[PDB]
Amino acid sequence: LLKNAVQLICYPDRIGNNLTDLHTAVEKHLSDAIGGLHILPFFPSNADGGFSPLTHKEVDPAFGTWDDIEAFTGKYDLCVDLTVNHISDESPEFRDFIANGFDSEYADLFVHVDRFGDISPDDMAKIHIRKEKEPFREVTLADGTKTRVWCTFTEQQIDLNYDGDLAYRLMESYIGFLTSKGVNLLRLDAFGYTTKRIGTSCFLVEPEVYRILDWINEVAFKHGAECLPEVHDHTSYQYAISRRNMHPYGFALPPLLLYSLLDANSVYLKNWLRMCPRNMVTVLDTHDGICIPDVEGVLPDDKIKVLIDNIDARSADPIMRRSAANIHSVGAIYQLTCTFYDALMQNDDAYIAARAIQFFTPGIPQVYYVGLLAGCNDQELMEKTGELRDINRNYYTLNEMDEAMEKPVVQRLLTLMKFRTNYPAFDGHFELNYSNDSSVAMAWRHGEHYCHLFVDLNFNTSKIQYVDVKSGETRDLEF
Amino acid sequence: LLKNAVQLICYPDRIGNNLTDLHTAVEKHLSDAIGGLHILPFFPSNADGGFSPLTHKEVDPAFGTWDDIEAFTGKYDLCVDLTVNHISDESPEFRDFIANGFDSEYADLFVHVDRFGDISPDDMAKIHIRKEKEPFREVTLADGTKTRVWCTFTEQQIDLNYDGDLAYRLMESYIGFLTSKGVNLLRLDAFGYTTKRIGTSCFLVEPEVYRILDWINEVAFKHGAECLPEVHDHTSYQYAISRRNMHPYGFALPPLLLYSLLDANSVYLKNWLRMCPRNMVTVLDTHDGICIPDVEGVLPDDKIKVLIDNIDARSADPIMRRSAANIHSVGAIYQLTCTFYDALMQNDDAYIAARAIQFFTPGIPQVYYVGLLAGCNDQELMEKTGELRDINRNYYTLNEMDEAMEKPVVQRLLTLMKFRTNYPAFDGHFELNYSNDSSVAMAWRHGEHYCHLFVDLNFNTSKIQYVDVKSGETRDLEF
Amino acid sequence: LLKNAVQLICYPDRIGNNLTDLHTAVEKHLSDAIGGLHILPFFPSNADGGFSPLTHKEVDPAFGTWDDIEAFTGKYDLCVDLTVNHISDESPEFRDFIANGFDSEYADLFVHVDRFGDISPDDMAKIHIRKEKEPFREVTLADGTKTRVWCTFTEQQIDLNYDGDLAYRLMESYIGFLTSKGVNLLRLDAFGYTTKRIGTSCFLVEPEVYRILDWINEVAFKHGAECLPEVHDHTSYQYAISRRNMHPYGFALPPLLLYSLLDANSVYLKNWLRMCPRNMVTVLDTHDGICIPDVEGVLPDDKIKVLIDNIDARSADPIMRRSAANIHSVGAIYQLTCTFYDALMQNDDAYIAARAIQFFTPGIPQVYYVGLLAGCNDQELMEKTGELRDINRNYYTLNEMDEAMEKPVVQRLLTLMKFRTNYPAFDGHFELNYSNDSSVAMAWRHGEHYCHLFVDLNFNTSKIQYVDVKSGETRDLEF
Ligand SMILES: O=P(O)(O)O[C@H]1O[C@H](CO)[C@@H](O)[C@H](O)[C@H]1O
Ligand SMILES: OC[C@H]1O[C@H](O)[C@H](O)[C@@H](O)[C@@H]1O
Ligand code: NA
């Protein structure tokens, strides 16, 4: 069991300069407002913001040491990424492949494109790949031979072969090591691409995907860890995850709420909460930006397009899904590049009301560090480094964070976080209440404990009433 | 009969400094990659990038001499402009009109607005306008009298009167001189504007336009030349040209391919290839902007707005087709001001694929020099001269071209150009192949010679298989 | 080479009672108004209105004898159907397959489904079939063995195998026999389905389709006959046919005029006329319903829907394409079940104006007999026999035809037919004229001969002025 408490999502090096400064910031400000951390990839990596790890057993010295990670465990749950799809081209295992060729003992760890034979144009177009080139890298071996390996993402990320056995060893090896350092929750990064079969989309291929997923879940449970598979596709996949004793992501909530607050409409939101999957980890913002496929169905297309058209002016160029010439269409946008606070027009009341609704949604709530600090789109950071997503990946010095913590909106968010992390009613059962089509009433009951949220989307007001058991009376949370 | 080879579209003075530097670059890089040249207007001109010639019988000394032109004819086809619509106001023929008035023997060579009497506003609205004012210039005669002449374009370009006889004389004289210098292909510039009749659109007025067009074709054949009539409107006009033993423009192809690659959609392209006008000169980019009206019907309107909206960010202010009686009105989009490479987001694979599809399209392919060198939008040049289309009219020094020739994408383009100009299969018959809705299959067969293009618009991939006749085996072209 | 004259489309037994009554009716009224006939299938048939022939070498005694056929030849062109795709299951060739099994010498004449092995679900969904059943018929052999054959249409129609040799003879045998009886023009029924290749649409498969189509055309040319391949799909195929010395169908014209007249719009019509494929056979109504896919592109989707909604009230249930649950969507309708006269709301002026535009469209005009007699939707005939297309397949007795010939509107149409068949200008060249966007101006010139149509689509007015060579002056055709 994880702590039913708010979690902080954060990089190692963007609050302060390293894992030690991160720990300093948490203890100074968040020591009793969060119950866990999701520390974004802190491994030796050579691509894509830490998501091309050479191994899961080392910490990039630029960030700290394993002792600096274990400083968080013992008081906080620890969520860490497991890049189950791919490992770096600089990894010991893949470098051994280039030197020795197919004589390498790590050969069957990777996907060899010539194994599949000729792939028809139809089977190629099926493949759910998000840039405009084939997912195939031609690498040159030490002996001069040219061969191709499966490569979904950037070329420094070589995909693993779940049709062989070696890949399961490596994950089981990684999991054993991470759990020994105190990892409670394994975020299964990009698991949907693990399933390759020519003739299918090679993404979330059923029922193979769940067998791979049940296996990893068993390994984590053996080593005292639960799983958080991250998938950006139709929400029906989140329920499949939910029904296999794993934590799905509440990705539908961010755009569902953004539309809901901007348009003063509680209908689709109440419909969702009433049927939202269980054991999910709810988010508003992530390190990636607001994802659209995750709300298809949850929100009608015309209302999704209203959302897209409303945010376009406050957001940088969106991340696109491939070959979508119609760049202002629901079917074209993959992720909206925007801080969540800019998505609500820097409206304090709207942002707090959103976080309250998140906190009363069933599941473990994660708060992204930029959102924690009510960060705005980082134009300056985005314009250097070229990374489109850095618009939501502010760097903070410890002073700049101390200063952001004094903003009135952050003090308000900080009270919600303390209330959600400590008040016992959230350990009970969720009971949605009746409301009109422009306001939402959410409540939690655990024995004598009870708390009740009411948000009027017409005026962005947030009211929480809770029962103080030490006195029996009903008080107003001041936030 | 023209050479079935790639042609270069180029100015005299924008590779190096003159026609002499131009000839140097052709022999160094393209000597066996092109079979002809379209050298943009190199006559004495006083407006609009050479298109206001005082005569077609002289070479602007800033560019070179007629001897510099004939250096190209001995080895290459020569396509040169015939401004059938207009000649300069500094021309001898028009200056004689200013001095002597209507007593000049060249008076009936020009269109006098006063023939019509009053022109009602309704008759004005029929005529489209390429300037910001009515196409009527008030000129002052030597004796002080004020009279008006028809002037479609800039006021230094005076339109000719094809209701009289003098205009046919001048064209026949112009044609004779150019063919005597080795000109094979006469580009009839803006011939659609030659037909004037109040009560009509004064543009492509039927059937007068075809009689004017059959006449010039007659003169050219006598002097050993074929014609390339330039008309930017519905593709139906391109077929009428094809059916009169003239070369139409494959003007439909550029915006069609831009869409086909951007959206990974081969349906509309495949339909067009199946019915494309025959004996046409195919282009992707020209010395002008990418023209939209030329793809109506070929491409549904909703997809055209998609295409236009996708290019808006990568293109300058568009050229508009305004009507009269309404001179300060946004009007309809005519040409997108953009390099073809910036129109494909500078995606190398997509650009090579575009040229591959062009080169397998039936007809003589022209490659515009900027496209040859994978040039980007020239913001600095456009802002320096104020000419909106100079964003696609880059200047290259001999060094700047030599360096651009070593770019990998230009090396790939140069391999295709050598293949298309030399491989004999293109002299046979075109045979389109079946494919899915995201790929194109084009093939050419001439006896034992056979070559096969496959372009997957999902991944922007280009594959050509050709048969080496001296051995009978099938090889892959490396590009 | 055919007579450039109006042709009659007619059944054998639906004017009068047999072919002799047809000959009687033709000579009495049309003897100098048409130059040829399209006699719909008059062979022994057991399915689909005559299109399931047991042989092309016999005439169904219910219709007459071959002598009744040769009575038309010598004075009229003769167009007869060649069902190149399929022959009846009661045919001599196929019964031998049932009797002997694969030991039959006619075994390789038919397509055996088990030859292809497993067909993936994707390869089945590709198949362009407009029914909701697999195009596979399970037949029981005489020896009890069960095997499957390819069957596009009704189960009495077994498809032919153009991967073998027997199919080509059977056509060559049919063609030799039909041309020996005086047939000029072979209507190649449903030729698009002759190409089978698993993984393709099995319809118009390029370039195989032209391999088959160039073959038949020569075999027909050998025996003094030209071909009329019927295909209902995008017009690009019509030019593809046109460019191989065969006659395409002007299938785009019927719905194009219907829109143009109903909405007073000549824009798309003039565009088509300017570029329409020629050496085509033009039709307005046929023995089939008014076909929608043949005008996609020629007419924008929004304007096609205008047509569909206007015809919905005056038409029976339309024939649908496969799994088209959206019964009010351009992409769903295949053919509109309606006579052409009811499609123009029984407006005499509008119907004549349509026929006038047809007769001046480049190509051989066919007049369907129901259109000839200005027939209305036959509710009674449709509700009996259950055949949805019989709403356009009126039965006429010899009296009923004599009576309809006296209708004022039929007298006008009969004047046009004489003019289009006899006036020599139509043997010259087509010249489209300028007109506003709500009227059409069409003219023909052949030497001294000249005729000029002007149709105002606002008011359905028809005027034809011709140069009478018997006096040299310009007269008005009275219709
Ligand atoms: O309609 P277009 O093609 O842009 O105009 C054409 O005639 C004009 C005057 O000759 C020139 O401005 C263009 O360079 C030429 O291509
Ligand atoms: O595979 C790694 C990529 O996708 C993952 O889901 C990460 O969340 C994203 O930040 C990264 O770009
Ligand atoms: Na693409």
Author numbering:
A (entry chain F), B (entry chain E), C (entry chain C): 2 to 480
Sentences from the study reporting this entry:
To the best of our knowledge, this represents the inaugural structure of a phosphorylase complex containing αGlc1-P within the GH13_18 subfamily. The MsGGP–αGlc1-P crystal (P212121 space group) contains six protomers (chains A, B, C, D, E, and F) in the asymmetric unit. In the asymmetric unit of the MsGGP–αGlc1-P structure, two protomers are characterized by the presence of a glucose and a glycerol molecule occupying the active site (subunits B and F), whereas two other protomers showcase an αGlc1-P molecule in the active site (subunits A and E) with clearly defined electron density. Notably, two additional protomers in the unit (subunits C and D) do not exhibit any ligand binding in the active region. The αGlc1-P could be modeled in density but appears slightly crowded because of the narrow binding pocket of MsGGP, suggesting a high degree of substrate selectivity. Because of steric hindrance, the phosphate group is oriented downward, resulting in a displacement of approximately 1.6 Å from the anomeric carbon compared with its position in the MsGGP–Glc–Gol structure. The glucosyl moiety of αGlc1-P is stabilized by hydrogen bonds through direct interactions with residues Asp49, His87, Arg188, Asp190, Glu231, His288, Asp289, and Arg390, which align with the glucose in the MsGGP–Glc–Gol structure. The phosphate group of αGlc1-P is effectively stabilized, oriented toward the exit channel, forming two hydrogen bonds and three salt bridges with Tyr335, Gln336, Arg131, His233, and Arg390. Conversely, in the MsGGP–αGlc1-P complex structure, loop A undergoes a conformational change, approaching loop B. Despite pushing loop B toward the active center, the channel formed by these two loops measures less than 5 Å. In contrast, in the MsGGP–αGlc1-P complex, the structure remains in a closed state to promote αGlc1-P hydrolysis.
